[PDB]
Amino acid sequence: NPLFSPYKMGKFNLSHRVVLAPMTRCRALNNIPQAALGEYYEQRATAGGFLITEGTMISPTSAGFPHVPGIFTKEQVREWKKIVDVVHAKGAVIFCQLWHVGRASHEVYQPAGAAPISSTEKPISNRWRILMPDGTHGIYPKPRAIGTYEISQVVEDYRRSALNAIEAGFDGIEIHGAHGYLIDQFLKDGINDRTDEYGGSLANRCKFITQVVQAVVSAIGADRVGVRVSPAIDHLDAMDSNPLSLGLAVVERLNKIQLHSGSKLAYLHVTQPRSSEEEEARLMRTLRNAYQGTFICSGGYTRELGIEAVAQGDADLVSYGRLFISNPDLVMRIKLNAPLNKYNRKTFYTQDPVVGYTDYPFLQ
Ligand SMILES: Cc1cc2nc3c(=O)[nH]c(=O)nc-3n(C[C@H](O)[C@H](O)[C@H](O)COP(=O)(O)O)c2cc1C
Fold first, then answer.
1. Which residue intervals make up region (FMN)?
2. Exposure pattern of 326-338 as b/e (b: 16+ CB <10 Å)?
3. Ligand 1 pocket check for 21: Cβ under 6 Å
4. What residues does each domain of the chain span?
5. Which ligand 1 atom is nearest residue 324's CA?
């Protein structure tokens, strides 16, 4: 089974290639990591396995879901340290995903009920609805398009949060540049309507992600930085007119950061849509072949599809989301080819510290 062939992810020696994909679960009450998160990540940690946390706020304006953790306060750092320690006690490697939602937010999630920030002043359309703290679905509001000074201060929020993650003991961080959130609002030509130096051309639309990645690389070192993007996912009205070209332009920026810094990033992590199969696969392989480094694929993977991806050279690591929700021992089940247990979508985003969170059983 090639998923169990060791892999060197820079300074990290992994024993297997099954990765816990980053998943928002909304148990971090009041944005503070809770003991429940410790039990949840400990259940899924394995010796030499790689875990990526749920998306974590970089600032008070960065949230668009209830009860997501932050890493911008020293109280948050203290509580994350307790979670990182239990994961490292099992010999796992763990990165914190740094997440800013941009326009995918609501007044209820913003300080003083201010407008969310974005590349644009246009709202996500009413084709999409935001999950509200009471469990209802709300309307995304009009965001405020930020100036370039404000862009630079968001970059400094990523930098500070990366340093905070290292302070809590994380092995590294992942930049969430996917799924229609703030970075993708700059990347995608279906969203970025700017006429300044952060809009228009591919080079301009890639400036924000390049500056975010360079800032964290300078602060913590490239080998502790992963980058996640999704050029071919249109979530929250985030379409590009040429997804492959956009992906390749991002990849060229990452290769350039590596050459300038004299080091490689920990990885590039791409999530694919599952609409089709041959075209989606070809786009993934084209991005992988363009990138000078480690490639993590994600989106709809199963045991068999992950085996195929590694065996065919299409990816170095395979991340799993929903199967890891319901199979805390997913790694062992994959190793043994044991049947996998279903997940219950109704408890993906609830606040209960146990139910649908830590009460999915291990193999008998
Ligand atoms: C409940 C849930 C929450 C998720 N939250 C995040 C997140 O915080 N950050 C992110 O980059 N992707 C997030 N994702 C996407 C997953 O990381 C992953 O790409 C997707 O689940 C992979 O597909 P799979 O579930 O078929 O394995 C989330 C997915 C789910 C189902």
1. 321-322
2. bbbbbbebbbeee
3. yes
4. 2-347
5. 27
